Write a protein that binds this ligand. Structure first.
Ligand SMILES: C/C(=C\[C@H](C)CCCCC(=O)O)[C@@H]1O[C@@H]2C=C[C@@H]1OC(=O)\C=C/C=C\C=C\[C@H]1O[C@@H]3C[C@H]1O[C@@H](/C=C/C[C@H]1O[C@H](C[C@H](O)[C@H]1C)[C@@H](O)[C@@H](O)/C=C/CC/C=C/C2)[C@@H]3C
Lengths: 50, 49, 159
């Protein structure tokens, strides 16, 4: 946003144009898969999930 | 600016997601706001996050 | 000048509607912040009524402007050198300028062009975007629909 605040022209831009959500959604998808703390639920008896 | 996050319903229930291998997600919605200092504006949308 | 319900045309974001006048304040002065929402991106704009002419808001265009843009159309005489990058830069500067007659000149130039030889993808997207905002302006000036204004174009696009 701070980059394209300057390169864009004024009196034409909007928050729909300024905002790129793809690094945020890539950070979420890169956390939930392929991290240490996000593991498969160990279920072979209900004590193990707990 | 950035303000007021609000959620929708989940797009698909639990068993259907576990069946069709979709994740159990819900959309974000955030009211962004752009203010021009020189001439005076706000630009308020509902940005899908 | 402004009243509630005037479909007043914002310069870049097409034609917009007003709802009320906010008397909100900065530094104690409750300026007449007209709340002006658009229908394209569903965004609402609040603008102080003082510098509305400075930002370049404009009321809707009438029959004399309709005859002027029909005069700008149907007159196929133009010259631009064949280095198409200069033509692209010229019509992009036009599109950032925001004048209805020049927008009509560029959509008639690109209609004359793609009717003749063929266009690139960015050229076609440029013609489509400028034509769609011109359709929106002509429809909200003549108080009618998109298909009606597009048929009006297709019968005045050098027909
Ligand atoms: C070494 C380690 C996790 C090991 C893979 C499992 C625990 C080792 C301890 C032990 O031997 O009991 C560390 O885990 C985390 C971060 C760094 C380390 O990961 C690491 O560096 C190593 C792997 C990190 C993420 C792996 C993700 C995916 O790899 C597959 C699918 C995803 O997860 C793995 C499965 C993990 C569940 C395990 O659960 C264990 C039993 C089995 O070993 C597994 C079923 C149970 O002991 C369970 O109750 C306990 C889990 C530990 C809780 C997390 C601690 C920190 C499966 C192999």
């Amino acid at each position: 946003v701070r980059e394209r605040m300057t390169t864009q022209d004024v009196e034409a831009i909007t928050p729909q144009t300024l905002i790129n959500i793809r690094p945020v959604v890539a950070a979420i998808k890169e956390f939930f898969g392929t991290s240490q703390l996000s593991q498969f639920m160990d279920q072979n008896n209900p004590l193990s999930g707990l | 600016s950035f303000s007021d996050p609000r959620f929708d319903d989940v797009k698909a229930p639990v068993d259907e997601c576990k069946d069709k291998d979709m994740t159990y997600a819900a959309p974000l919605f955030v009211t962004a706001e752009f203010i021009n200092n020189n001439t005076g504006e706000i630009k308020s949308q509902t940005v899908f996050m | 000048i402004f009243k509630v319900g005037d479909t007043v045309v914002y310069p870049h974001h097409g034609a917009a509607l007003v709802e009320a006048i906010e008397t909100r304040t900065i530094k104690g002065e409750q300026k007449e912040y007209l709340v002006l929402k658009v229908a394209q991106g569903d965004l609402t704009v609040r603008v102080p009524a003082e510098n509305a002419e400075y930002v370049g808001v404009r009321d809707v265009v009438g029959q004399e402007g309709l005859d002027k843009v029909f005069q700008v159309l149907r007159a196929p005489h133009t010259e631009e050198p064949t280095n198409w990058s200069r033509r692209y830069k010229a019509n992009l500067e036009k599109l950032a300028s925001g004048d209805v007659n020049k927008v009509a000149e560029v959509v008639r130039d690109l209609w004359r062009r793609d009717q003749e030889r063929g266009l690139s993808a960015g050229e076609k997207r440029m013609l489509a975007k400028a034509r769609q905002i011109l359709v929106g302006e002509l429809a909200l000036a003549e108080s009618t629909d998109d298909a009606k204004a597009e048929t009006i174009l297709d019968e005045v696009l050098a027909a």
